[PDB]
Amino acid sequence: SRWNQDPGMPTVIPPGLTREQERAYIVQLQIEDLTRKLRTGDLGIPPNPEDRSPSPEPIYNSEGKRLNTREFRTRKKLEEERHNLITEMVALNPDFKPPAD
Amino acid sequence: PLGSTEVLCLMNMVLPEELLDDEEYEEIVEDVRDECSKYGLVKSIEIPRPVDGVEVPGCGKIFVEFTSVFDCQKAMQGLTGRKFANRVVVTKYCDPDSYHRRDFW
């Protein structure tokens, strides 16, 4: 399956919100989770390499250390999605102060 | 809309990229169905997908029509705050009329 079983923003959308105000809430909320996942950082890497996609050819630096690890690749996507979401609200701002992180 | 309706909207579950593959799409469908089926007898499901670069409305959202308002209201309470592919599941109610007319939001 895909589903998940076991102090952020309320998970239910408040009562009356414009199509825009709602979009702002959900984006602001993802910005929240993405920041958390990158802080811990709690990535979404599966424990076993069975469900994982085939790995790309490994590339290394001068020390012989691999650069494109699973973790690096996955942390990239999160950083990428977070960036676009942050950038999405750049063409919105109600004078919303950028974090600059 | 104002209050509870018989249509549940799951949000922040998927990104357009995941929906391109037919194999993955069909899977996402039954996963949502089976989970909701625990409160289910659900009437229908709608997961709009590119069709890029049209960017058809409701894309990135998942709609589930329940048979009753009570059922739906119980589905949201249970599903809200959960994870989906490690993503936080956000929820709201949708106007059933809008939904039948395929005006997905």
B92: contact with A, CB 8 A cutoff: yes
What residues of chain A lie within 8 A of the CB of B89, using their CB? 11
Is the Cβ pair A4, B86 closer than 8 Å? Answer: yes
One-character DSSP codes across A13-60: PPSS--HHHHHHHHHHHHHHHHHHHHHH------SSTTSSPPPPPP-B
| Residues B15 and A78: beta-carbon distance below 8 Å | no
What residues of chain A lie within 8 A of the CB of B38, using their CB? none
Contacts of B94 (CB under 8 A, 6+ apart): B1, B5, B7, B8, B9, B63, B105
Beta bridge partners of A12: B91
Classify B26 in phi/psi space as left (phi over 0), alpha (psi -120 to 50) or beta.
alpha
Nearest to A11 among B31, B80, B86 (CB): B80
The span from the CA of B99 to the CA of A46, in Å, is 35
The span from the CA of B39 to the CA of A13, in Å, is 21
A53: contact with B, CB 8 A cutoff: no
What residues of chain B lie within 8 A of the CB of A22, using their CB? 92
Resolution for this experimental structure (Å): 2.3
Q: What's the Cα-to-Cα distance from A72 to each of A38, A46, A75, rounded to whole Å?
A: 11, 14, 5
Is the Cβ pair A2, B76 closer than 8 Å? Answer: no
Q: Which domains does chain B have, with CATH numbers?
A: 1-105 (3.30.70.330)
The span from the CA of B81 to the CA of B89, in Å, is 6
B31: contact with A, CB 8 A cutoff: yes
